[PDB]
């Protein structure tokens, strides 16, 4: 037999040293010496968490909750279920805790980020980075910056190498591309400096290069950059899925071999947890297009329908099926499918009517297309739209209606934005059109 205070001293020594496997083994020894000690159970669950076996730690907490009671180990089980992708349970675990602790606040911010509740997540992260001081403040700043960047990128509100990359992400969300490439080159420089003072952390920076290059139109450079990104074999899986998807978007119809080899990578292990809702939704969006383009229609319809199950979220996927019907010599069914969707949702209706009109310019029924285009309120005055409307009107000499559109657009602009460049363009061209035919 050995003294229990000696075991506690040696456990503390092992914990301060950083060794956790042997510390766990001796915590097992002390707990088999004395089984009704709360501190031993807390130490062993901490050891299991740090060893990476979250399942065993959750098992220990659940099967010893009866003996635990008292203050409860809420934070440890919340973190264990978090790292096991049980975020919904982590919510109730944090909310139901007896008292609020800084560890609980940090975990609360992280789970709030993982569920895209960016308003509350940003607020709680602001409180964390304001009222709490430690030696991880730079990571707190990059976490808050990542929160803001994701919020701007997806929910679309105006706002070291990690900070620069996150600001590049925020600027990409804001649509600015050249300045994003500049700050990304700066982050590339800082990555090079830190790595010289290993290559995997490089690739992610390059990930935001080619996506910009593809956004700016420089497809040829972006494809080579993606090829070298994959040839580096990065350890990340979510970034591999993103890179594969962007290679799909660049490839479009051509180079089906790249497309299939990248779809082999888009659905990999752990992909669904690293990526967000919007990113996975867009990957599903791209899968259906690829399937229609080169794969059999039997799988094109399935993927688009599966996304349509998730469709009420965002990023209207009905058009994939509409285009597939148009590819199957069926246009009236497509028109009905567009029309019902337009009727169901009124806030999304405007932009989708634009797609209906184009179909009714395929071979005839132009006047109905002009009627649909006129039916898009808040967008009738827009100069491109008025020009297209007037030329379609002039196809079958529907003049007086064209002047009516001209004057109503003039009235709209003059009441809204008098003396506008576009409004003055409209008035001069309306005067010219009245001059032509009288």
């Amino acid at each position: 037999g050995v003294s229990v205070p000696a075991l506690w001293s040696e456990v503390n020594r092992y914990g301060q040293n950083g060794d956790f496997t042997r510390a766990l083994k001796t915590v097992n020894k002390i707990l088999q010496i004395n089984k009704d000690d709360v501190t031993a159970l807390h130490c062993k669950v901490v050891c299991l968490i740090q060893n990476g076996s979250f399942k065993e730690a959750l098992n220990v907490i659940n099967t010893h909750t009866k003996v635990l009671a008292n203050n409860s180990l809420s934070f440890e089980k919340a973190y264990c279920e978090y790292r096991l992708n049980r975020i919904e349970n982590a919510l109730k675990t944090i909310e139901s805790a007896n008292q609020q602790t800084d560890k609980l606040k940090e975990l609360y911010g992280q789970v709030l980020y993982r569920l895209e509740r960016y308003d509350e997540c940003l607020a709680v992260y602001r409180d964390l980075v304001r009222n709490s001081q430690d030696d991880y403040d730079e990571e707190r700043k990059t976490n808050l910056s990542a929160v803001v960047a994701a919020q701007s990128n997806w929910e679309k509100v105006v706002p070291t190498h990690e900070l620069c990359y996150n600001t590049a992400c925020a600027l990409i969300g804001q649509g600015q591309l050249n300045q994003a490439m500049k700050i990304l080159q700066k982050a590339e420089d800082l990555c090079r400096r830190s790595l010289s003072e290993p290559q995997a952390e490089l690739a992610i920076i390059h990930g935001q290069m080619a996506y910009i290059l593809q956004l700016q139109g420089r497809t040829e450079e972006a494809l080579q950059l993606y090829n070298q990104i994959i040839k580096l074999k990065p350890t990340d899986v979510g970034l591999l899925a993103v890179i594969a998807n962007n290679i799909i978007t660049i490839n479009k119809d051509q180079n089906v071999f790249d497309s299939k080899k990248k779809v082999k990578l888009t659905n990999a292990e752990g992909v669904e947890f690293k990526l967000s809702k919007k990113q996975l939704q867009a990957i599903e969006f791209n899968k259906a297009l690829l399937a229609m383009y080169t794969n059999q229609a039997e799988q094109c319809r399935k993927i688009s329908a599966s996304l349509q199950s998730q469709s009420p979220e965002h990023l209207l996927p009905v058009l994939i099926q509409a285009a597939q019907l148009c590819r199957e010599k069926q246009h009236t069914k497509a028109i009905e499918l567009l029309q019902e969707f337009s009727d169901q949702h009124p806030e999304n209706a405007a932009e989708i009517k634009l797609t209906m009109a184009q179909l009714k310019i395929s071979q005839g029924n132009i006047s109905k297309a002009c009627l649909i285009l006129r039916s898009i309120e808040e967008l009738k005055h827009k100069p491109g739209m008025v020009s297209a409307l007037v030329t379609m009107y002039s196809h079958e000499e529907d003049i007086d209606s064209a002047i009516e559109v001209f004057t109503q657009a003039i009235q709209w602009y003059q009441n809204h934005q008098p003396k506008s460049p576009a409004h003055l363009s409209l008035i001069r061209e309306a005067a010219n059109f009245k001059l032509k035919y009288g």
């Binding site: 456990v11 914990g15 978090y82 992280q110 992400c169 925020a170 992610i204 867009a282 184009q358 030329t391």
Partner: protein
Amino acid sequence: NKPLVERFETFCLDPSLVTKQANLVHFPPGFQPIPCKPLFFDLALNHVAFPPLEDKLE
């Protein structure tokens, strides 16, 4: 080349708008490229530590 959806703030009587190749909208719709996700760190793992053992120490 671009669809009219990207040329709304531009008045120009394009003849093809009255022909078969109207090109009002991307049909089939264009692919959706996604920006790479921002960088996020697990700062809760640094809080996983032993409780104060001094009350039950040697």
